[PDB]
Amino acid sequence: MDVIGERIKRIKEEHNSTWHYDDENPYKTWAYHGSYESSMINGVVKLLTKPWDVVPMVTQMAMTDTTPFGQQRVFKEKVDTRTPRPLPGTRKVMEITAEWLWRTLGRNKRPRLCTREEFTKKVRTNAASAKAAVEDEEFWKLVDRERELHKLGKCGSCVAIWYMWLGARYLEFEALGFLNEDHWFSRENSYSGVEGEGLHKLGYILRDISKIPGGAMYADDTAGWDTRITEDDLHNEEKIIQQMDPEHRQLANAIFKLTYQNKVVKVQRPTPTGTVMDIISRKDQRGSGQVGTYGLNTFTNMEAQLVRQMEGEGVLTKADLENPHLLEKKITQWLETKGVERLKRMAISGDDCVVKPIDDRFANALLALNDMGKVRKDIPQWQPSKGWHDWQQVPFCSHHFHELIMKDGRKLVVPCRPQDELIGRARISQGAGWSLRETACLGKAYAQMWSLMYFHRRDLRLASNAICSAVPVHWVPTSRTTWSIHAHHQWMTTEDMLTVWNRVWIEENPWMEDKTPVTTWENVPYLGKREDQWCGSLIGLTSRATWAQNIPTAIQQVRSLIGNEEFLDYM
Ligand SMILES: [Zn+2]
Ligand SMILES: [Zn+2]
């Protein structure tokens, strides 16, 4: 590759004091040119969740393997592998579907550049430490310089000096940020997308899909989705440039060509001498850390599922996939007549998908899915997918969903996951060197999230009150509970939680017809005991009963360690 030398010659330039090329490199498809050369437990939450001191899943999450072994062997194992090129017929159909999809996605919207001001706003609020750069003119000078490089068809630093990484990310956000900021994959615009809907809506969306007449609901994982993105996928995602103004088109074509279709990655290797870092390149796959990775994964997944549905419906044959002169017409006619309707049968979030086809031939439509490189996880290539007849069974975005019948007769659809995962996560604190205060506040953060998202789990509501009772009323929850793009962080507030519960689940809930306020937590429903239990609850156990009865004691213990602040009783 010619158009790659600049970044190869730059890291060579600074790191010449240790530079060489190793003959013992574990890179068999990642082309190689050279190489050079801590997270505690939340004490508050733990104290109030004693019965979970034992639980294996809880213990497992309280273990972090990040530095010495856990990313040198993990982020390297099944990544340096190839994907066979899709057949020519497959390639044609994909190309038509991508053309049609971009056109559809852009029917009401025009692509535009995002701005320094927009990027500043987002960095300040924490979204999707780096502040120093953002209030620094020099940073924007470096940004401007690399932009002039991109404009000329060249790339310098898109791989303190932390300014280059962020710089790269901004330019990316500048050329492709519109996909998120202008909501291209919101349900209203994308039909299959759920971007910006929020976790508290995902269940309602699944239930609406369940009402569409058809076969079962399918939700196959892809084994390492990002590793499965082909050169062909990348070229189809690029078709979005056609809709851009000349000035935007340049900057975008730069991003795709230089950082998507021709990447330069830095990664460490355990060379038995010292801590070394390798520099490698590849024409395909996806790098997670990129702004707009989500947009393009949602896009390619949407396309992929449309192709599977097409095969399911008999539009695509093995013969069609092999045909280097496959005719466009039947795909075009399928897309133009049935395209949108088939998108309405789907919920897609990056590599997460749920699909409800018109019948169950879909279960066996595997030719194209396999040939496209999107091989399902933990299943023989050619075994039909398991479908679910109950939408409540369907996994999506680490959750499943339940319908609840409130005492007043109304219904809620609520997010849920095995309780140990919830408690295990709350019991962890990201990073060492925290005071009790910052620790108490992260707990409250989790506690209030549980009262808005998982209030229907008996144990988590009790733990929730316990935490809120032990932490001063006026202390503001800080630091996030999750990085999920589906989280709207309504729990990050000193506003009383039943007021917020009412805003989220009654007032602003478009699926709630009757707007009558809930005046007490006693009218906020639980999962049935039975379901609560199958989802991990400890209700019924005596250790849980003891903890419940003896919770006031531990609350007081936490209280006297915090000091003579203002407390409220939530039990
Ligand atoms: Zn660059
Ligand atoms: Zn559940």
UniProtKB/Swiss-Prot annotation:
| Record topological domains on the Cytoplasmic side | 1-571
Processing and modification events after translation = Sumoylation of RNA-directed RNA polymerase NS5 increases NS5 protein stability allowing proper viral RNA replication. Phosphorylated on serines residues. This phosphorylation may trigger NS5 nuclear localization.
Residues binding Zn(2+) 1, per UniProt: E146, H150, C155, C158
Boundaries of each RdRp catalytic domain copy?
Answer: 216-366
Which interval of the chain is the signal sequence?
Answer: none
The organism's place on the tree of life at top rank: Viruses
Q: Where in the cell is it found?
A: Host endoplasmic reticulum membrane; Host nucleus
Name the reaction it catalyses.
Answer: a 5'-end (5'-triphosphoguanosine)-ribonucleoside in mRNA + S-adenosyl-L-methionine = a 5'-end (N(7)-methyl 5'-triphosphoguanosine)-ribonucleoside in mRNA + S-adenosyl-L-homocysteine; a 5'-end (N(7)-methyl 5'-triphosphoguanosine)-ribonucleoside in mRNA + S-adenosyl-L-methionine = a 5'-end (N(7)-methyl 5'-triphosphoguanosine)-(2'-O-methyl-ribonucleoside) in mRNA + S-adenosyl-L-homocysteine + H(+)
Residues bound to Zn(2+) 2 are H400, C416, C535
Indicate how the chain sits in the lipid bilayer.
Peripheral membrane protein
* Subunit-structure text: Homodimer. Interacts with host STAT2; this interaction inhibits the phosphorylation of the latter, and, when all viral proteins are present (polyprotein), targets STAT2 for degradation. Interacts with serine protease NS3.
**What is known about what this protein does?**
Replicates the viral (+) and (-) RNA genome, and performs the capping of genomes in the cytoplasm. Besides its role in RNA genome replication, also prevents the establishment of cellular antiviral state by blocking the interferon-alpha/beta (IFN-alpha/beta) signaling pathway. Inhibits host TYK2 and STAT2 phosphorylation, thereby preventing activation of JAK-STAT signaling pathway.
Name assigned to this protein: RNA-directed RNA polymerase NS5
Q: What is the lineage of its organism?
A: Viruses, Riboviria, Orthornavirae, Kitrinoviricota, Flasuviricetes
**Which stretch of the full sequence is covered here?**
2763 to 3373 of 3390
